[PDB]
Amino acid sequence: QFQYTLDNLTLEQRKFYEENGFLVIKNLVPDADIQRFRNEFEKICRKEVKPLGLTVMRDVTISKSEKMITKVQDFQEDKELFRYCTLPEILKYVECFTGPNIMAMHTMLINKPPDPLHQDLHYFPFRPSDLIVCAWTAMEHISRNNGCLVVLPGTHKGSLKPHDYHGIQDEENKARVHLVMEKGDTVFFHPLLIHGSGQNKTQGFRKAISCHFASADCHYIDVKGTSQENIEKNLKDIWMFRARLVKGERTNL
Ligand SMILES: O=C(O)CCC(=O)C(=O)O
Ligand SMILES: [Fe+2]
């Protein structure tokens, strides 16, 4: 052998990960913990809690204007949200991809409003991609109606494609899968897996929380002269300042 998983937790659901580049573990995060994430998000939403280095996207406004939160990133200095990263149920599985030295590298809570494909790695200037994993958990029932994740199975085996931005303007040849998930369900997936969110044709805001983890043994690459040049918009340091040791030891990242 396997390239995308290590030994052990897991069966020929390794064989699945290896052919597909994603794996869904049912009812992984307790209802209790999901509600705690919900609660903290809404406090942020009421400007009652103001975490330290947190980024807020308000990409939608509403009138009867006033802007609504649609994503928060870099919540590593917020305690209830950061428990997601430290949660032993999440880590018993993360280790299968990263190994025993684990860094929580990118944190998001996504609040998709009522209504494009990409590779998360476009944004990550660190390697090997095989020792990096996104852990993405449904904070409510997510189906095709409210914009669940779409994935192109097996594209984790292919190259890093160029992006404009949320970006790939092409390379398919395996039928898409819509990841309908229940509350607490978690999907694990590779940074080169081509994916996107479908339309949210409901009137509700659709919540998921997620983290990309990477082996501490990984390293930082220079993106000048590559497809990734654009992300710079030094970079090693912003990602170093953001990275948090979540298990084992901080070796190299
Ligand atoms: O809409 C989502 O839940 C995930 C968004 C996404 O794919 C990303 O930020 O990379
Ligand atoms: Fe993504």
Distance of alpha carbon 182 from alpha carbon 33, whole angstroms:
14
Distance of alpha carbon 128 from alpha carbon 134, whole angstroms:
14
Other CB atoms within a 10 A radius of the CB of residue 94 amount to 25
Asked how this structure was determined, the answer is X-ray
Other CB atoms within a 10 A radius of the CB of residue 54 amount to 18
Q: Could you tell me which residues come within 8 angstroms of residue 240 by beta carbon, excluding any fewer than 6 positions away?
A: 220, 253
Distance of alpha carbon 21 from alpha carbon 16, whole angstroms:
8
Whose structure tokens read 């280790």? 95
What H or E segment, with its residue span, contains residue 111?
strand 102-112
**DSSP-assigned states of every residue in 178-202:** EE-B-TT-EEEE-TT-EEEE--B-S
Distance of alpha carbon 90 from alpha carbon 187, whole angstroms:
10
Distance of alpha carbon 62 from alpha carbon 67, whole angstroms:
7
Distance of alpha carbon 230 from alpha carbon 189, whole angstroms:
24
With vertex at residue 164, the alpha carbon angle to CA 160 and CA 166, rounded to the nearest 5 degrees, is 80
Q: Could you tell me which residues come within 8 angstroms of residue 64 by beta carbon, excluding any fewer than 6 positions away?
A: none
Annotated binding site: 71, 108, 118-120, 136, 195, 197, 206
Which-ligand-closest: CA of 110?
A: 1
Distance in Å, CA 219 to ligand 1 centroid: 24
Which-ligand-closest: CA of 137?
A: 1
Annotated binding site for 2-oxoglutarate: 71, 108, 118-120, 136, 197, 206
The resolution in angstroms reads 2.5
If one residue of 165, 193, 210 were mutated to test the ligand 1 pocket, choosing by the most ligand atoms within 8 A of its CB, it would be 210
Number of domains in the chain: 1
Q: Which CATH number does the domain housing residue 6 bear?
A: 2.60.120.620
Whose structure tokens read 């025993």? 100
Phi, psi torsion values for 14, nearest 5 degrees: -70, -50
- Which domain, by its residues, includes 150? 1-253
- 136 CA: nearest ligand 1 atom: 3
Distance of alpha carbon 100 from alpha carbon 181, whole angstroms:
28
Residue 197 in contact with ligand 1 by CB distance below 6 A: yes
Hey, what amino acid is at 129? S
Q: Are 103 and 213 in contact (CB under 8 A)?
A: yes
What H or E segment, with its residue span, contains residue 31?
helix 31-45
Residue 112 in contact with ligand 1 by CB distance below 6 A: yes
**Which residues lie near ion ligand 2 (Cβ < 5 Å)?**
120
Distance in Å, CA 100 to ligand 2 centroid: 25
110 forms beta bridges with: 71, 208
149 forms beta bridges with: 179, 197
Q: Would you give the distance in Å from CA 17 to the centre of its chain?
A: 16
Hey, what amino acid is at 81? L
178-198: burial string, b at 16+ Cβ within 10 Å, e else? ebbbebbbbbbbbbbbbbebb
With vertex at residue 226, the alpha carbon angle to CA 237 and CA 73, rounded to the nearest 5 degrees, is 45
DSSP assignment letter at 171: -
